[PDB]
UniProtKB/Swiss-Prot annotation:
Homodimer. Interacts with MAG. Interacts with RTN4. Interacts with NGFR. Interacts with LINGO1. Interacts with KIAA0319L. Interacts with OLFM1; this inhibits interaction with LINGO1 and NGFR. Interacts with OMG. Residues 2-32 form the LRRNT domain. One of its GO terms (molecular function) is ganglioside GT1b binding. Glycans are attached at residues 57, 154. This is Reticulon-4 receptor. The lineage of its organism: Eukaryota, Metazoa, Chordata, Craniata, Vertebrata. GO terms for cellular component: axonal growth cone; cell surface; dendritic shaft; endoplasmic reticulum; external side of plasma membrane; glutamatergic synapse; growth cone; membrane raft. Its main location: membrane. LRR repeats lie at residues 33-54, 57-78, 81-103, 106-127, 130-151, 154-175, 178-199, 202-223. Belongs to the Nogo receptor family. It is a lipid-anchor; GPI-anchor. N-glycosylated. O-glycosylated. Contains terminal sialic acid groups on its glycan chains. One of its GO terms (biological process) is cell surface receptor signaling pathway.
Length: 295
């Protein structure tokens, strides 16, 4: 039967619904035929291995807005039909065992926003070949290691804003051939490797505003042949000789772009790099140092 104060019904999908009823733990005796399990808004602190293993046909599991501090690495083992997993708004989770998501080959959406996550461990997203949406915003990430998303060939939306990512290495986004939207704003990005976006030929939206970029090689943006929306505002852009390549790329860009506000030199403060004449970019505003500032 139906456990605790949960509500169980069959249409449109077999559902076990137990939201906001003061649960401290995952209830036992969840009906095995459950296709959807809603446990959001309680005070659940742990997800043991045995939690959902009877539920063969499970496709949707919501655990957002709880008090999750730990998830057993075997919590979601054998849930081969799982399509939606929501662990968001558990700000004290901090860490997910790198094997937690292994075997989830039907997973389409993974909500990990506002989980206080400190890092993306090796192999955390291995084998998630069906994943389309990955929410990682508003965590505590301080790195984007190479090949973190290597197997995510069907991913279309990747949200990484509201972290503390300091830089983007060459192969951080390797394998993301289907990616359409990449949100990297409100981080600490000080540099992007020249070939970091090589595989993003189908990207349509890129947000990089509210970071720490003083410059960006044109090579960074060159592979983004499908780009339609670009945001680069709220960065400390240096509008001198080092900006000439980005300037030139911007002149030919047919999409929509934010302001690219100059921070230096003072005479160009808050004017748009995009809207400057090439003659404004002569010289060096500093006089670690870019090539044109050495010659
Ligand atoms: C999954 O759904 C099928 C309906 O085709 C049903 O026969 C089966 O018992 C369900 N699985 C469980 C564990 O109840
Ligand atoms: C990836 O998407 C394609 C087309 O959208 C689909 O044929 C394929 O089955 C998807 N991959 C997985 C693992 O579901
Ligand atoms: C931006 O990065 C530079 C690295 O040269 C560093 O000196 C500076 O403190 C950073 N600014 C902020 C606001 O983090």
């Amino acid at each position: 039967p139906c456990p605790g104060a949960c509500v169980c019904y069959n249409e449109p999908k077999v559902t076990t619904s137990c939201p906001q009823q003061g649960l401290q733990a995952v209830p036992t005796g969840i009906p095995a035929s459950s296709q959807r399990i809603f446990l959001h808004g309680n005070r659940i602190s742990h997800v043991p291995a045995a939690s959902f293993q009877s539920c063969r046909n499970l496709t949707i599991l919501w655990l957002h807005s709880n008090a999750l501090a730990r998830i057993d690495a075997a919590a979601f083992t054998g849930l081969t039909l799982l399509e939606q997993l929501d662990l968001s708004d558990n700000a004290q989770l901090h860490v997910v065992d790198p094997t937690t998501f292994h075997g989830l080959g039907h997973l389409h959406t993974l909500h990990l926003d506002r989980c206080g996550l400190r890092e993306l461990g090796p192999g955390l997203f291995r084998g998630l070949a069906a994943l389309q949406y990955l929410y990682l915003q508003d965590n505590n990430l301080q790195a984007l290691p190479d090949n973190t998303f290597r197997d995510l060939g069907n991913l279309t939306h990747l949200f990484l804003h509201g972290n503390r990512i300091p830089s983007v290495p060459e192969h951080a986004f390797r394998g993301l051939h289907s990616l359409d939207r990449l949100l990297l704003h409100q981080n600490h990005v000080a540099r992007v490797h020249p070939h970091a976006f090589r595989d993003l030929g189908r990207l349509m939206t890129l947000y990089l505003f509210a970071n720490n970029l003083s410059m960006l090689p044109a090579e960074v943006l060159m592979p983004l042949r499908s780009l339609q929306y670009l945001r680069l505002n709220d960065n400390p852009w240096v509008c001198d000789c080092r900006a000439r390549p980005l300037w030139a790329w911007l002149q030919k860009f047919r999409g929509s772009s934010s302001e690219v506000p100059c921070n230096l030199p003072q005479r160009l403060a808050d004017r748009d790099l995009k809207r400057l004449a090439a003659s404004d970019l002569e010289g060096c505003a500093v006089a670690s140092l870019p090539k044109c500032c050495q010659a």
